[PDB]
Amino acid sequence: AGLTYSQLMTLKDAMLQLDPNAKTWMDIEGRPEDPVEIALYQPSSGAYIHFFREPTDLKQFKQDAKYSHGIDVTDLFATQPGLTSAVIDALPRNMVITCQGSDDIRKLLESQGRKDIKLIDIALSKTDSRKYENAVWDQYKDLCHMHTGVVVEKEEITPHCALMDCIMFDAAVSGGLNTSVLRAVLPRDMVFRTSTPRVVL
Ligand SMILES: [Mg+2]
Ligand SMILES: [Zn+2]
């Protein structure tokens, strides 16, 4: 089972925090039939939707962890099951989503019966898409702690985060990196079934 009725209602109310006509980036880590990290980002307000999912196929996950996202699967055991379907079900009707390489996003959305959502494929080159990568992690690394493993290429590389990807691709297309305080749309008790409280220093 997934979200309770009150979680669904809380989620429906939280989605009103998105502007259904504003620019909205989306990115995922993992394959579209088996995603482990999902992010949606509205640069205009700073609002973002960001959550995690436990993988079905461990073998593919462990390859993605080594070559892409660096996520330790044990850190996904406490995620809310069914959240991916509930968030996508809840997205505003006929909203427009921007992505870098729309194919994976499109397959995800279509698998959930959301063909009404229009996609904008930004099609940045590899190097252009990551031109603000280091700056984006430095400004915003506190927003995602889930990329704990070392990630390699065909040489070590900075892990890929669906949320950092949205921020840096928007900056690359906008032609600079804004100073904006971002804000999580989903409550933390929705993202994780059991969650660590804020650290008391
Ligand atoms: Mg990406
Ligand atoms: Zn991340």
Q: Return the structure tokens found at 108.
A: 């995800």
Three-state DSSP class for residue 28: strand
- How far is it, in rounded angstroms, from Cα 64 to Cα 58? 10
Residue 54 marked ligand-binding: no
Flag whether 27 is marked binding: yes
> What's the token pair of residue 141?
């690394």
**Both structure tokens of 76:** 């996904």
- Kindly give the distance from the C-alpha atom of residue 179 to the centroid of ligand 2, in angstroms, as a whole number: 20
Determine the distance separating the centroid of ligand 2 and the alpha carbon of 62, expressed in angstroms: 16
Rounded distance from Cα 167 to ligand 2 centre (Å): 11
The answer to the question of whether 64 is labelled as a binding residue is no
Q: Which residue has the tokens 């031109």?
A: 131
Instruction: Note the ligand closest to the C-alpha atom of 100.
Output: 1
How remote is the CA of residue 25 from the centroid of ligand 1, in Å?
Answer: 11
Q: Tokens 């069914």 map to which residue?
A: 82
From edge to edge, which strands make up the β-sheet containing 47-52? 118-121, 96-99, 25-31, 34-42, 47-52, 183-184
Angle 170-145-59 from CA coordinates, rounded to 5°: 95
3-class secondary-structure state, position 197: coil
Q: Which residues contact 171 (CB under 8 A, 6 or more apart)?
A: 132, 135, 136, 177, 178
**What's the CA gap between 81 and 53, in Å, rounded?**
7
CA dist., res. 119 & res. 31, Å (int)? 18
- Cα–ligand 1 centroid distance for 159 (angstroms): 10
Which run of H or E residues covers position 102?
helix 102-111
CB 100 within 8 A of CB 129: yes
Return the DSSP state at 54: -
Closest ligand, as measured to the CA of 37: 2
- Per the annotation, does 110 bind a ligand? no
Give the C-alpha separation, 145 to 195, whole Å.
Answer: 13
How far does the centroid of ligand 2 lie from the alpha carbon of residue 118, in Å?
Answer: 24
Q: Minimum-distance ligand to the CA of 52?
A: 2
Residue 74 burial by Cβ neighbours in a 10 Å radius (0-12, 13-18, 19+): exposed
d(CA 24, CA 41): 5
Q: According to the annotation, is 166 in a ligand binding site?
A: no
Rg (CA), the chain: 16
Which ligand is nearest the CA of 161, by number?
2
Residue 143 in contact with residue 50, Cβ under 8 Å? yes
SS3 165: helix
Q: Minimal CA–CA distance to 166: which of 99, 119, 120, 102?
A: 99
145 is in an annotated binding site: no
Q: Is 147 annotated as a binding residue?
A: yes
Residue 14: in which H helix or E strand, if any? helix 5-15
Tell me the one-letter amino acid at 172: A
Q: Are 61 and 30 in contact (CB under 8 A)?
A: yes
Please give the structure tokens belonging to residue 120.
């904008």
CA nearest to 72, candidates 54, 57, 84: 54
Give the separation between CA 191 and CA 15, rounded to whole angstroms: 14
What's the start-to-end Cα distance of the chain, in Å?
37
For the chain, the domains span: 1-194
Q: Go through the chain and tell me how many residues it has.
A: 201
In contact, 51 and 83? CB cutoff 8 Å: yes
